[PDB]
Design an enzyme around this catalytic site. Structure first.
Site, PDB file in Angstrom:
ATOM      1  N   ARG A   1      -0.155  62.737 -16.284  1.00 23.47           N
ATOM      2  CA  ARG A   1      -0.214  64.249 -16.904  1.00 23.47           C
ATOM      3  C   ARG A   1      -1.542  64.429 -16.899  1.00 23.47           C
ATOM      4  O   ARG A   1      -2.375  63.371 -17.386  1.00 23.47           O
ATOM      5  CB  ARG A   1       0.319  64.210 -18.045  1.00 23.47           C
ATOM      6  CG  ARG A   1       1.881  64.480 -18.299  1.00 23.47           C
ATOM      7  CD  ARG A   1       2.547  64.536 -19.465  1.00 23.47           C
ATOM      8  NE  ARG A   1       2.597  63.363 -20.509  1.00 23.47           N
ATOM      9  CZ  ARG A   1       1.463  63.345 -21.036  1.00 23.47           C
ATOM     10  NH1 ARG A   1       0.466  64.295 -21.517  1.00 23.47           N
ATOM     11  NH2 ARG A   1       1.432  62.239 -22.118  1.00 23.47           N
TER      12      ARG A   1
ATOM     13  N   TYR B   1       3.171  64.081  -9.511  1.00 22.69           N
ATOM     14  CA  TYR B   1       3.615  63.114 -10.542  1.00 22.69           C
ATOM     15  C   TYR B   1       4.604  63.604 -11.397  1.00 22.69           C
ATOM     16  O   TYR B   1       4.480  64.652 -12.113  1.00 22.69           O
ATOM     17  CB  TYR B   1       2.231  62.490 -11.427  1.00 22.69           C
ATOM     18  CG  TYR B   1       2.688  61.910 -12.594  1.00 22.69           C
ATOM     19  CD1 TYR B   1       2.958  60.536 -12.793  1.00 22.69           C
ATOM     20  CD2 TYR B   1       2.522  62.482 -13.667  1.00 22.69           C
ATOM     21  CE1 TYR B   1       3.233  60.023 -13.802  1.00 22.69           C
ATOM     22  CE2 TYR B   1       3.239  61.837 -15.039  1.00 22.69           C
ATOM     23  CZ  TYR B   1       3.423  60.384 -14.977  1.00 22.69           C
ATOM     24  OH  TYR B   1       3.838  59.916 -16.191  1.00 22.69           O
TER      25      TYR B   1
ATOM     26  N   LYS C   1       9.145  67.008 -19.540  1.00 21.30           N
ATOM     27  CA  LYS C   1       8.243  67.144 -20.648  1.00 21.30           C
ATOM     28  C   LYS C   1       8.016  68.825 -20.621  1.00 21.30           C
ATOM     29  O   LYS C   1       7.967  69.606 -21.939  1.00 21.30           O
ATOM     30  CB  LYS C   1       6.870  66.677 -20.442  1.00 21.30           C
ATOM     31  CG  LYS C   1       7.015  65.170 -20.305  1.00 21.30           C
ATOM     32  CD  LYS C   1       7.454  64.611 -21.624  1.00 21.30           C
ATOM     33  CE  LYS C   1       7.739  63.180 -21.589  1.00 21.30           C
ATOM     34  NZ  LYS C   1       7.468  62.220 -22.596  1.00 21.30           N
TER      35      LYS C   1
ATOM     36  N   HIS D   1      10.005  64.386 -29.085  1.00 15.45           N
ATOM     37  CA  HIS D   1       9.811  63.089 -28.344  1.00 15.45           C
ATOM     38  C   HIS D   1      10.232  61.928 -28.866  1.00 15.45           C
ATOM     39  O   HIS D   1       9.710  60.899 -29.408  1.00 15.45           O
ATOM     40  CB  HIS D   1       8.151  62.974 -28.097  1.00 15.45           C
ATOM     41  CG  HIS D   1       7.526  62.086 -26.986  1.00 15.45           C
ATOM     42  ND1 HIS D   1       6.526  61.605 -27.111  1.00 15.45           N
ATOM     43  CD2 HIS D   1       8.281  61.577 -25.950  1.00 15.45           C
ATOM     44  CE1 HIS D   1       6.176  61.021 -26.065  1.00 15.45           C
ATOM     45  NE2 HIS D   1       7.552  60.798 -25.194  1.00 15.45           N
TER      46      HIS D   1
ATOM     47  N   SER E   1       2.829  57.481 -26.220  1.00 15.26           N
ATOM     48  CA  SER E   1       2.747  56.681 -24.880  1.00 15.26           C
ATOM     49  C   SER E   1       2.266  55.433 -25.313  1.00 15.26           C
ATOM     50  O   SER E   1       1.548  55.088 -26.102  1.00 15.26           O
ATOM     51  CB  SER E   1       1.676  57.262 -23.859  1.00 15.26           C
ATOM     52  OG  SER E   1       0.915  56.435 -23.345  1.00 15.26           O
TER      53      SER E   1
ATOM     54  N   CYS F   1       3.735  52.938 -26.695  1.00 14.98           N
ATOM     55  CA  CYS F   1       3.913  52.284 -28.203  1.00 14.98           C
ATOM     56  C   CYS F   1       5.491  51.782 -28.152  1.00 14.98           C
ATOM     57  O   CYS F   1       5.735  51.390 -29.319  1.00 14.98           O
ATOM     58  CB  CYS F   1       3.891  53.413 -29.136  1.00 14.98           C
ATOM     59  SG  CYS F   1       2.032  53.737 -29.059  1.00 14.98           S
TER      60      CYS F   1
ATOM     61  N   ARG G   1       5.894  53.826 -12.551  1.00 11.37           N
ATOM     62  CA  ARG G   1       7.227  53.933 -13.243  1.00 11.37           C
ATOM     63  C   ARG G   1       8.356  53.668 -12.592  1.00 11.37           C
ATOM     64  O   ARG G   1       8.521  53.394 -11.256  1.00 11.37           O
ATOM     65  CB  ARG G   1       7.332  55.577 -13.249  1.00 11.37           C
ATOM     66  CG  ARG G   1       6.339  56.314 -14.217  1.00 11.37           C
ATOM     67  CD  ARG G   1       6.659  56.386 -15.449  1.00 11.37           C
ATOM     68  NE  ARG G   1       5.567  56.811 -16.307  1.00 11.37           N
ATOM     69  CZ  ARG G   1       5.651  56.901 -17.833  1.00 11.37           C
ATOM     70  NH1 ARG G   1       6.818  56.896 -18.391  1.00 11.37           N
ATOM     71  NH2 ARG G   1       4.593  57.332 -18.521  1.00 11.37           N
TER      72      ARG G   1
HETATM   73  N1  LIG Z   1       3.574  43.667 -29.157  1.00 13.16           N
HETATM   74  C1  LIG Z   1       4.542  44.380 -28.564  1.00 13.16           C
HETATM   75  N2  LIG Z   1       4.604  45.123 -27.807  1.00 13.16           N
HETATM   76  C2  LIG Z   1       5.462  46.052 -27.114  1.00 13.16           C
HETATM   77  C3  LIG Z   1       6.436  46.044 -28.192  1.00 13.16           C
HETATM   78  N3  LIG Z   1       7.341  47.148 -27.647  1.00 13.16           N
HETATM   79  C4  LIG Z   1       7.006  47.403 -26.533  1.00 13.16           C
HETATM   80  N4  LIG Z   1       5.723  46.650 -26.192  1.00 13.16           N
HETATM   81  C5  LIG Z   1       4.772  46.804 -25.328  1.00 13.16           C
HETATM   82  O1  LIG Z   1       4.435  48.384 -25.304  1.00 13.16           O
HETATM   83  C6  LIG Z   1       4.250  48.852 -23.992  1.00 13.16           C
HETATM   84  C7  LIG Z   1       4.802  50.046 -23.549  1.00 13.16           C
HETATM   85  O2  LIG Z   1       6.382  50.106 -23.866  1.00 13.16           O
HETATM   86  P1  LIG Z   1       7.313  51.226 -23.303  1.00 13.16           P
HETATM   87  O3  LIG Z   1       8.820  50.814 -23.972  1.00 13.16           O
HETATM   88  O4  LIG Z   1       7.190  51.582 -22.012  1.00 13.16           O
HETATM   89  O5  LIG Z   1       6.784  52.391 -24.396  1.00 13.16           O
HETATM   90  P2  LIG Z   1       7.307  54.097 -24.090  1.00 13.16           P
HETATM   91  O6  LIG Z   1       7.207  54.558 -25.691  1.00 13.16           O
HETATM   92  O7  LIG Z   1       8.751  53.886 -23.544  1.00 13.16           O
HETATM   93  C8  LIG Z   1       6.031  54.906 -23.073  1.00 13.16           C
HETATM   94  P3  LIG Z   1       6.792  56.525 -22.358  1.00 13.16           P
HETATM   95  O8  LIG Z   1       6.863  57.722 -23.432  1.00 13.16           O
HETATM   96  O9  LIG Z   1       5.766  57.252 -21.157  1.00 13.16           O
HETATM   97  O10 LIG Z   1       7.882  56.128 -21.596  1.00 13.16           O
HETATM   98  C9  LIG Z   1       5.010  47.649 -22.915  1.00 13.16           C
HETATM   99  O11 LIG Z   1       3.874  46.953 -22.181  1.00 13.16           O
HETATM  100  C10 LIG Z   1       5.495  46.817 -24.006  1.00 13.16           C
HETATM  101  O12 LIG Z   1       5.574  45.481 -23.602  1.00 13.16           O
HETATM  102  C11 LIG Z   1       6.747  45.554 -29.405  1.00 13.16           C
HETATM  103  O13 LIG Z   1       7.526  45.510 -30.275  1.00 13.16           O
HETATM  104  N5  LIG Z   1       5.460  44.474 -29.549  1.00 13.16           N
HETATM  105 MN   LIG Z   2       9.652  55.182 -22.068  1.00 16.60          MN
HETATM  106 MN   LIG Z   3       7.600  60.015 -23.095  1.00 15.06          MN
END
Ligand SMILES: Nc1nc2c(ncn2[C@@H]2O[C@H](COP(=O)(O)OP(=O)(O)CP(=O)(O)O)[C@@H](O)[C@H]2O)c(=O)[nH]1
Ligand SMILES: [Mn+2]
Ligand SMILES: [Mn+2]
Length: 603
Positions: free
Chosen positions: A78, A226, A235, A255, A277, A279, A396
């Site tokens: 985005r 994208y 979104k 979200h 994002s 997190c 993705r």
């Molecule tokens: N240290 C640690 N890293 C974490 C934890 N949960 C996720 N991560 C890392 O955070 C990164 C992103 O995780 P993801 O589950 O894709 O986040 P999202 O909130 O779904 C991202 P989006 O909204 O775009 O889909 C990954 O590399 C993951 O390994 C956690 O409890 N601990």
């Molecule tokens: Mn996600």
């Molecule tokens: Mn998202």
């Protein structure tokens, strides 16, 4: 007439308003042909075939019906600065900040948007097929479901919408003569092509513009293929457009992932969580919990629509039909349920490809067999010595939600699931404990308002909605506050988490992933009625968090609350909120700013 250009379906089978929308935009965009999508498997295979022939998709032979798209590297995310909301009055869209430019959205005038539209859409689909995608956000039916029609010149958008929404003839049948959100998208590269084509992926980065016109219920997107920019139901519609509808109608569009967690005695609660994002929403939403006897089931991983029911319960539904997940970091160890989900019928975008037609990406944690080599997302032979990742960091997968092995049995229930806890959080390497609980609804709202996350920069991202507010954030804060005056409201408990606190060597203090089940257990029992008071909220009492099975955790540093840090913290939160929200900042939030400063001064 138009009928002559229709290569699938019949204009006469469209409800008149849908036909008018198509007619008007086909006249404007001038596609060579029109394809009315039916959502059928046969159509899907057809479009994948065509995309394979055109170089848009490559088959990944290691799997059952999985495919890979590589994009132009200029079109991979985005673009906030190119994403706007258009309203007659600026204040309806974003608050006028005290200093600086708003960081709470981007408004464009009706007049300026008309000039942009006219500089982009006329003749934009020349030489291309315009696809008509009827789609439903929410179960085909539900009280809480909304329909849209997306016109697009991108078969990649079609197949991705088939997965991420309910799509096709059945939605047109449900829609009948009802209202729908008008979604217009073009990749912005009419033929003959005027510029080079990279990876067969058309885009027009220079003119890219993603616009929302709430009063007209239109979303108009130009220049990017994208997902965040082109899958208009998600979104653009289910967060931005919907958040404004929600405020006007007494509901919420957020979200948030939604999961259902069951304890070893069979008691089950649904929790919602908003994280920015990078997190961890997807990881939490389909967690494999480490604690014996507990279960987690996924309702949704990205977007939640929530509305009080007749007994005051805040009910959530997931308006999406699939998961559009960040691939890198996904492994059997970190998210085994995601790996299982994506084994079939999945489209990947910008990941690496192994010589046996498998996928690959940073953090997949899967050693290659002898002789197997990697092609990067830029279509180059790749090694770890090259100084660049094999997969784009925001690459993705796009996969059916019905395929998650722990998909919740009520993920499509039209009544929604009752939310008992809302969780906020982000990446904070310092200062913020693993988990704390808000002191009241108004304090909870302030906690959401105050969110910051590291992206070496730490940025504000209130309620993880910074890029997604469909209207003025001060009014969004008032809308959330007003929930506490809803008659007989059963307000969810609010918590804030941080999986990412680090020690001085930058190593995580908490193992995370499946071990986050220990944090969930604490919340679950707090919801059922223990706590240690602190100026920022309640934390677990000494020994209350279940650490059985873990190696050593430095609980004291992990739960450390420093006056110096928090003095700085609240000073930053105050400045941000007063400056950015300004005349629209609700008094209740002011009281909470002061109340926290007061509490911190007492330490
Ligand atoms: N240290 C640690 N890293 C974490 C934890 N949960 C996720 N991560 C890392 O955070 C990164 C992103 O995780 P993801 O589950 O894709 O986040 P999202 O909130 O779904 C991202 P989006 O909204 O775009 O889909 C990954 O590399 C993951 O390994 C956690 O409890 N601990
Ligand atoms: Mn996600
Ligand atoms: Mn998202």
């Amino acid at each position: 007439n138009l009928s002559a250009k229709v290569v699938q379906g019949s204009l006469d089978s469209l409800p008149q308003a849908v036909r008018e929308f198509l007619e008007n935009n086909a006249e404007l965009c001038q596609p060579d042909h029109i394809h009315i999508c039916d959502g059928s498997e046969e159509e899907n295979g057809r479009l994948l075939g065509q995309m394979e022939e055109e170089g848009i998709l490559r088959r990944l032979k290691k799997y059952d019906n999985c495919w890979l798209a590589l994009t132009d590297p200029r079109d991979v995310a985005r673009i906030e600065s190119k994403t706007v909301i258009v309203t007659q009055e600026q204040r309806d869209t974003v608050p006028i900040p005290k200093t600086g430019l708003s960081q709470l959205g981007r408004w464009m005038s009706e007049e300026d948007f008309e000039k942009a539209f006219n500089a982009r859409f006329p003749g934009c689909m020349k030489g291309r097929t315009m696809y008509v995608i009827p789609f439903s956000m929410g179960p085909l039916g539900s009280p809480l479901s909304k329909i849209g029609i997306e016109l697009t010149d991108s078969p990649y958008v079609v197949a991705s919408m088939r997965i991420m929404t309910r799509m096709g003839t059945p939605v047109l049948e449900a829609l009948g003569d009802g209202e729908f959100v008008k979604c217009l998208h073009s990749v912005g590269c009419p033929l003959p092509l005027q510029k080079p084509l990279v990876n067969n992926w058309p885009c027009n980065p220079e003119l890219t513009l993603i616009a929302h016109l709430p009063d007209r219920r239109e979303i108009i997107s130009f220049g990017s293929g994208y997902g965040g920019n082109s899958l208009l139901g998600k979104k653009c519609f289910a967060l931005r457009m919907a958040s404004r509808l929600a405020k006007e109608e007494g509901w919420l569009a957020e979200h948030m992932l939604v999961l259902g967690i069951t304890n070893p005695e069979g008691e089950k609660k649904y929790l919602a969580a908003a994280f920015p994002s990078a997190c961890g929403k997807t990881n939490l939403a389909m967690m494999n919990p480490s604690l014996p006897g507990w279960k987690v089931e996924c309702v949704g991983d990205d977007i939640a629509w929530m509305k009080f029911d007749a007994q005051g319960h805040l009910r959530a539904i997931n308006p999406e039909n699939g998961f559009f997940g960040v691939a890198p970091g996904t492994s059997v160890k970190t998210n085994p349920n995601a790996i299982k989900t994506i084994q079939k019928n999945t489209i990947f975008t910008n990941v690496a490809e192994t010589s046996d037609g498998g996928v690959y990406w940073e953090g997949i944690d899967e050693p290659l067999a002898s002789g197997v080599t990697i092609t990067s997302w830029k279509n180059k032979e790749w090694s770890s010595e090259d100084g660049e990742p094999c997969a784009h960091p925001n690459s993705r997968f796009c996969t059916p939600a019905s395929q998650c092995p722990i998909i919740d049995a009520a993920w499509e229930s039209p009544e929604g699931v009752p939310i008992e806890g809302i969780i906020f959080g982000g990446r904070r390497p310092a200062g913020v404990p693993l988990v704390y609980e808000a002191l009241s609804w108004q304090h909870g709202v302030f906690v959401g308002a105050a969110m910051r996350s590291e992206a070496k920069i730490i940025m504000h991202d209130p309620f993880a909605m910074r890029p997604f507010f469909g209207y003025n954030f001060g009014k969004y804060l008032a809308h959330w506050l007003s929930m506490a005056q809803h008659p007989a409201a059963k307000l969810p408990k609010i918590f804030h988490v941080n999986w990412f606190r680090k020690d001085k060597e930058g190593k995580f203090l908490w193992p995370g992933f499946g071990e986050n089940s220990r944090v969930l257990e604490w919340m679950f029992n707090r919801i059922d009625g223990s706590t240690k008071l602190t100026p920022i909220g309640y934390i677990p009492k000494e020994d209350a968090l279940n650490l059985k099975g873990l190696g050593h955790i430095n609980m004291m540093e992990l739960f450390s609350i420093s006056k110096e840090f928090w003095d700085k913290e609240v000073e930053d939160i105050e400045k941000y909120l007063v400056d950015q929200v300004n005349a629209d900042l609700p008094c209740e939030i002011e009281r909470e700013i002061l109340a926290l400063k007061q509490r911190i001064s007492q330490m």
